[model samples]
Target: KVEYDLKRLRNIGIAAHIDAGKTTTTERILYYTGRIHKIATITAAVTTCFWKDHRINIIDAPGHVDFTIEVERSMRVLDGAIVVFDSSQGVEPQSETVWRQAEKYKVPRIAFANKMDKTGADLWLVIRTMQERLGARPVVMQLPIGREDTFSGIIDVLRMKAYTYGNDLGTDIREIPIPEEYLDQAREYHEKLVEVAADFDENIMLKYLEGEEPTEEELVAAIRKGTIDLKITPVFLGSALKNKGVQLLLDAVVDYLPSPLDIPPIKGTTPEGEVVEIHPDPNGPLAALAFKIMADPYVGRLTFIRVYSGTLTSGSYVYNTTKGRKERVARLLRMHANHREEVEELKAGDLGAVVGLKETITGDTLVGEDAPRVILESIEVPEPVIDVAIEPKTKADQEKLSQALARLAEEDPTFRVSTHPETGQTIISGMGELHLEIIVDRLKREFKVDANVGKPQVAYRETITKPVDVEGKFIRQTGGRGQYGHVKIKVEPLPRGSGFEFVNAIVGGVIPKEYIPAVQKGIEEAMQSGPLIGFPVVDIKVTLYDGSYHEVDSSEMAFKIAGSMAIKEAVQKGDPVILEPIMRVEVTTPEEYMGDVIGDLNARRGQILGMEPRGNAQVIRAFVPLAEMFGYATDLRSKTQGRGSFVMFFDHYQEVPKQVQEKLIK
Candidate 1:
């Protein structure tokens, strides 16, 4: 095997708009780098992705807006990424959302404008949109040698050279001198490069001002520094399907992307609550945070962790700080997409995998013995918007469906599958139709469980409008003993997104301090089960103000039930109303469809915030009710003629209109 140093290793993901050839590009990278013997296809993902060698870890995320949460979870574990945009289509709807996701994670990225050979591909339009819309100031490092049918290779602007490839997907490597005919175009891009790279050094600036061309090495050095520091993101051109220009991309990764040591020192707090700096010390204490977990029936759970400090050995024990559990590491493997290679240990600044980690999950921190650690904050995923009530075909199917839902829920935070307490119909909820569809598909394909899924439903909630005091008393008279519990609770409405809050306001031993918490727990339970339509209640405060308790009979159970009782009574009196989740929708559609998009949202009771020009299209932002948006996925398709795409997320809960509340109540 041809081995590069650890410093030469890059743990990055390849992402793009749907059908942008991201998977093809990744396959090319693997083949060109001589890491794989053959290319892998995205056909029937179950076999292709699950059967690959796992060394050069890479995650290929779905580029559809419907699978946004899948894109989200992928970004959490990615160190850096290559955003592959189709040269023909430029940026699409899901491109905007994934770009937002990358920005949220602060992931460094290099834009790859793929498919220059396509008929409609326009290089300048794609580059300009990336700059204006994506807020990226990228320097063009490579330009296509030819366009459409004449496309062959890429001209390296920095080196003033060109590289072309042969027909074999795996066995082609050839470099050609820049043609005299295209020398002028290549020089035009070179001049653009010198202007952006000038900020790298004062000397380069002075030389450029004097009308002197800087040495090629000097220009490349400056470009490297700028790209690595994010001052300038460099664009690369290629068609991965034909295996052309892929090697230059790999070389650029080694030249521009930040090495693990190049990253800023890891900063976190210790278990003792003191801020600590973790240097990339191989001999340092073991500190690894599990960011992504993949569970398989054969190999069990594979946890992808970024080691902040020290090293971890296989077949060893570690402490999971987030879960507060102990686990034994059975084996350590390095991932190359779906393939695996067993390694004895992994050091700091490396991405490693652990297997047989019982009780450990994504977002858990594994610290070594004698090491004081801190649990990093967890990820915030959007709430599930579309719901699918599930009904089993048979009793055996019911048992299998229950087990499958449990496993799927453990992996995706955005997808929730739960049994309706009263209805008993298993319900599944997700970010969108495509999101839940993929889950259901996996349930049947991967989990081997089949069940019928019902029509879509919107998950709604309820809250009170004012404060009301009520008494909760549960008394039982028995032959051997008696139970007595009494408490007074004052419930008030909190602003939307404030969530649930409890205050202990009792004084002078009105109710024992310990019993006050029981009251809060009861109220919390009531909120979870809901008051209006049996949905979880949010943005409310309950105060355990005053009450008397029987010394022997007023156990925790009595007070818990009493608290639940009082909140329900108080909410009924305070004019409780259904609160529908309002989603902040961002739509990117053809300019011609802008008016129709706005009108459609208006009919659905949405308030248009504004519309702005974006690239060849327009971006419309609106706040729309969740209830009327259950089937929006299919609606958007018919509305936009398969070209319109939008993403919506829960912004807050708002009181439903009176007329709407009547229909929702029943």
Candidate 2:
């Protein structure tokens, strides 16, 4: 039997910019819901809480772009999201990035203007930035009774009621009439709320047009409809640190955010490419997606899955359609932060972890053996933009280091481990410097392996700007037999971000079917190291249209060698250029340092995007190459006297200037 009501289950994620108080707000929610008796800091984890008889499953995701995979995968499986914003800072750079990510996944979201007790906190400015920067239509759900330091309560616009907390701990509360001074402002925002809600409901529109006040129930229903449709986000305000307005936020979550049944049916495609909708039905065939893979010391390996249909029980074998394998679920666990509670089963629309699944990773679909072979959409992993060479400090740490790196790579889709072909040194790559730093930290703390790390290196890529045709022939005469392989290929440049593409236009058995795959594989291997500076090649296409082979001596090895030779020659002549990672950087500094900061950025070959005034600071937005950004934190601290802060993320690849290219080549 299904243990929970499907309509009452809310699968939501709490995401925001770095230092936006997502953790504090989540801890407050957990405490109020009685899930945890005390407040504490939390890392990225899945936790469940109850509010007003509704079950809310909250996935706390990391805010840094280095851990963006956490947010991306979390956004993939979540039905709704709470986008927390620091009220004092309005819309930050990372906030824009996370908001765009949520938009890409079409996740309906509600905005929380947190830290209302801080100086410079302005709800209007937050709403304005949400409109201008995020392109979001925000419906004001509540009005702050006072500005900044005096922020003590929130007036519910829909209910036309006021609730003020008497103490900072939120233990004392009183319901009173709206203060006379703020009553007019409250009425204006309430009118705006009803106006926006009118667009989503005809009844509300008729009543609004007639200047007749709609009942609170009608207004809530209309706002909920608008929110679920992604038309408008309802904005709430509070100081999570002060423990004010958390209960109302919880009420808003239950009243406005969507349940699993409220969303559209999950979409999947069969092996034959037929589209199918997987509805949330406990009695239906099992359909689940393993969205995360974590290594737990106690549980061994944990595979976090969101079940879209049917039920998953402990000790049952499920088919992994992506890997074409079957694995048994040794146990089922409901997680609250790092703590786990064993459960018998996870029903439809539920998120839980399963143990003892081998050969299963993130984005893999698990289904019943009798179910159709359907594959759900997989999570998109961003490419690593920075790399560093690592080595074990002692001989005893060598084997353990390799094991640790492999486990870390398996857990994070964005973190990659590769070896330098010529130097044979271990190279670890990730989104940024901090990302790799965290990985190294984990290696020592979690795996107990000490290692030495090298300086960070930009992950440059090589691409062609023009198309060229070339020929490669491998002919050798040995004592035993002679080897001969000939090929004619065309190489062309693809648009940036397209990656590599191979086409086989062989006709009339020019190249035998058996040797075709070998040629492609050889081309792929050769593309791994470009001739320019041995950097990886990307965004290029290769076509093998003509080739000659010897009947007796011609083999896959010969063709593979010939194909590899052809690509190396083709790239050298195809106007190859090195592409460097450019970061979207935002520096928030005091107005006094704006001139110096911009000047320094200009010296680093940065392209100034624009500048905006945020609170008492000036936010400078620019795009700078990663190569010139090394040790920027120290430099900025000195330049601004430790009064400036910045955030950066990988933006896109740009061709290096001729001067920089010449220096690299030499």
Candidate 3:
């Protein structure tokens, strides 16, 4: 039975910074939505819950910076998001990070000022930070009834109703008249809501100007429109731990969050180089994206997919357009954390997993046979910034270690495993220290392989500072039909974060079509190790504008060698420089140790960005080199008497100072 209602389906995720109560909010949502009896807790995969007759699929994204890839993939598949913030801290570093990720995907979001029951919980501060730090327009949809420990209820600004909770069960919520003391403040916020809603609805604008008030329904409609358009974020106040205002947050989700039918049609590109939009229709041709891959011991391998069009059924065949292969769908299962419910099929706009599929990974497009072959945009994986050498503790564990690392790398795009060319040691690299730490822990726990880990090494890079043109020629006459190839190319520096770009500027078949790809591939391989310190090169552009082919003598191998020769020489002449990873670090410390902490940071060549007062402590933000950050946790604890903590993430690469560069070269 293939029956689906696109209008009542919501695909959303819960995202936030570390310690922002994301998991608590998710558990409370599951409880209030009647999905689970008690509050409990990544897979961040997909969990289906029902709220007020609407089907809400929620992905609980991890908040730590190390698992940022979790948030990135979730944002790509989610149509809406509920960004949770610790009201006490307003916006933390990771909060800004995840918020920017959501913005990159254009995901409509609603803000939840959580932890209102904790001291220093200020909704206004959260709002101000949302505007200043996140560049978000947060429309306050609810107001808290009291401050700190007395935060018992919320006032619905749109409906002008008050909801108070008598117990911590979240079931004793009572909808009563606005309390007399908070009535004036609620009215002022409600009027401001109308004023913002006016920009979206002309009728509301005229009503506001003519001394008339828009009805609750009209205001909800306007706000919903603005939210789906990503023009405004409707803010809700709640204390998930105390079980207050969660039920209303659910109601607002159904009211403001966009359903599958509410969003614009998904975009994809046909195999023939044509762009097309795929709308959510059960009868339409199949177009699904595998956004996650998991290896389950009981089920072998599971591929979680989001169906954008048509229906997916068990015991059927779907073509993996990305890999150009066909795979059979063994079974379909709807997931709720670790629990699974067998389903016959998943319809358009539905999230489910398929078992017994091989040769498919995350970001691969799966489409129906005989349908228009299309490739959807894939997830962008960030480069790893830290590396550590690893080895099996015993000879028997070596094989298992390799197998485990391979599986882990396949599951996570950001995790990488490679062998060092010089040392012949296995190197595992990731986004941060915690990221690799978890990987090592998983190796021992899940794979049952104990391994030894070396000191962390920064993943430095190299780039050129100027542009130049060069020629590479390779000719040999000693052998019969000797190899001959000549190529002229230009190399230039790109702005930081631009990555490596290869432009095929060859015209009039100057280098034969078949040999051009070899040149590009050769150039890419050349970038793997730069001349300076042999680090990987990045943020440079190579253009193959001219070349010559000798017909019988010229071959792909010859051209490939020439291309590599050209790039190395061009980079040497283009003023190459060593680049190092810079981290955006935030230190939360007591006031008494501020001077010492700042002094230590300065000694490490850190650039102090700014400082803000948070609660009784101060939060200092700076950009510090990752190379200088090792052993910082212990140092910070010693300096602050264990009252200080810090979080850092990879920001961008910068050229090392002359002295540092000289030391590194030596």
Candidate 4:
């Protein structure tokens, strides 16, 4: 076991747009921290997936629009995050999408404007977007020393010093005064920085107003306080790919990112509904939250957890409060992309992984037996958008295919598989086109399952707006064994998302107690083949109000079928309307095409909720039909001329418009 002052620790994520050099930035941080001997590059598919971590852990997540679950999960568990934006392109679509995920989690954030060496990079544009889109009110901590090829150093307006890094990532330090070309620019920004920092604190504001300028420590202190409280987000400008300014950025992280104690106490509840706030202390009861699960082909299953309270030692046993099961912590590890170091324990405020947690899953909280079950808000892992009808390519693959699919689904939440009953097709779904492709490829390479993958398909759901009721009677009187069953039920529409419900209102034996269940069963049976379109029914309620049943042959099956039948009949006659799953979608398209993207969504029967500036793109939030969005990936590419991207997740189901419903029911 190891221990350190909680103040010395930071659990942060390095987030960015793809190709923005997040991996490069991460490598440099690890190097400066002395946590790694060599930099691991994520470029060329070369990334240490996780960064070398000790007291401070760094998680580098994918920034693709479709791989949103990565950003979502990482945001849920990190104490803070460094959002890396491309200096040249500014903010990309994926960058804005991840920012929303961070905002949703209310995770503390810092912005690193990378790619200062690249052409056309604009630091101010990126900063403005942060305020306009994220409402971050960014305060510049460091301004680029130069632009483009002349980019060599960063002016630390906060500390008012110049730190330069050579092309080879050398640590050699030399005195170089702030460039004469940028003196006025530096003073203007520095004064702006101090003003923003001191506004929240009366003492600092008074001192500033009186022209009693504070020392360097005072400015950093004020900035640190304001940043952690989220009043101001300090933006750092540099080119990560150039290996410039990483060390100073690393220093800023330790200076600003919050420790575990800086956060509010974790809250939980017992099954009995008593609320408890667990103090983040090593001596506190054991409490850790599982935020991610990765089905690794090499390591089997991986779960990333945050130790919320107490010391979690290897070989110890903890109970998963959500699952009501005990699991052994066989091994603890510090992950750095593909590299890992075995550790004996993890303390509160730290992130670590445990293997062999076959039953524990995402959002499960493991705690001491004395710890109560706490139902905390969870990060939403979206349903798979694009699906493929897959088949075994060879007879040999058939036997192993099911096993392979189950294992893969267990590993990656974004990858989902199910056998569609109506189509009888084995369907695999994922975040996007490439996501499912990776799953299929891994199935072949790692599971040895030879499979033929089909084109992507859209996933649709069924529901009803109106309700009616019907009776279901099954009578077989032909042979030595005769079956007789009759059930009566009444069904009604439930509010959208209320889901299915069954009620038994039998009285005085008109319907035998044993046969009452049959009515419920009947409704379920009919509900599967929805009233109008043969889609599985949802958001309905069935009641067994009155019915007669035989003593000898009546059974639960009969009532179940009767319940389903009532649902079917009610949905059919009660102004039943076809319902389509609607998704809350956010699109990140370049400013040049913002209007086009909004128009495109409107054409899809989508209602644009809002469009906000995020980085270099516009984040357009809208609600669109799942059916209409089926082939959206290909369309988005064509519309944006390949400069657009999007992310979507299930929001709720809605009744299809009358005209569209008319065509759908048939």
- CA-lDDT, candidates in order: 0.72, 0.84, 0.83, 0.71
Candidate 2 regions off by >4 Å?
Answer: 1-3, 35-44, 63-68, 90-93, 337-339, 379-387, 392-400, 406-424, 429-437, 444-452, 456-664
* Tens digits of per-residue lDDT for model 1, 599-664: 999999999999876544577899998777867866876777656667777787778898897786
The TM-score between candidate 1 and the true structure equals: 0.72
lDDT of 4 by residue, 1-666 (tens): 735567767778877766777677877765666535555322111122222232567754443446665556556567788988887774464466556566556667788998888888889888887877556788888888777888778888876777766664555555477888887888888888878878866777888788776777877777877777767788987766667777677777877777777766767666677777777788777888787776555566777788878888889888887777889888987765436668888888787678768888777778876655565434355656667887887777877888887756665545766666566667887656667877777778878887777886555446655556567666665455455566666667788767888776777787777666456555555665665666667777777767666666655665565455556556766666666668889887767768888888899999989988654456789999877886787798777766566777778667777788667644
Better candidate number, 1 or 3, judged by TM-score: 1
What value of lDDT does candidate 4 attain over all alpha carbons?
0.71
Specify the poorest-scoring 10-residue window by lDDT in model 2.
35-44
lDDT of 3 at 389: 92
lDDT, candidate 2, 1-666, per-residue tens = 545899899889887777898889988887788744346323434677678878888875443454555655677688998999998884364566566566657788899999899998888888997886566889899999877778878899888899998988868889989999989988998999989888888988999999999988888888898888888889998999998889999999999999988888889999888888999998999999888787776777888899999999899999999888889999998876445679989999998889889789877899987877789864345559989898888878989998887766667756888888657778989888888888878888879987778988889999889999998788888668888778899999999999888898998898888899888877887888898889988999999999999988887778888898999999999999999999989887767778999999999999999998754457799999989999997898778765566777778899999889888874
Would you estimate the TM-scores of all the predictions?
Answer: 0.72, 0.70, 0.69, 0.73
RMSD of candidate 1 to the truth, in angstroms, is 7.4
Which 10-residue window of candidate 3 scores lowest in summed lDDT?
Answer: 35-44
Span of ten consecutive residues with least summed lDDT in model 1? 43-52
The candidate with the higher TM-score, 2 or 3, is 2
Question: Which is superior by lDDT, 2 or 4?
Answer: 2
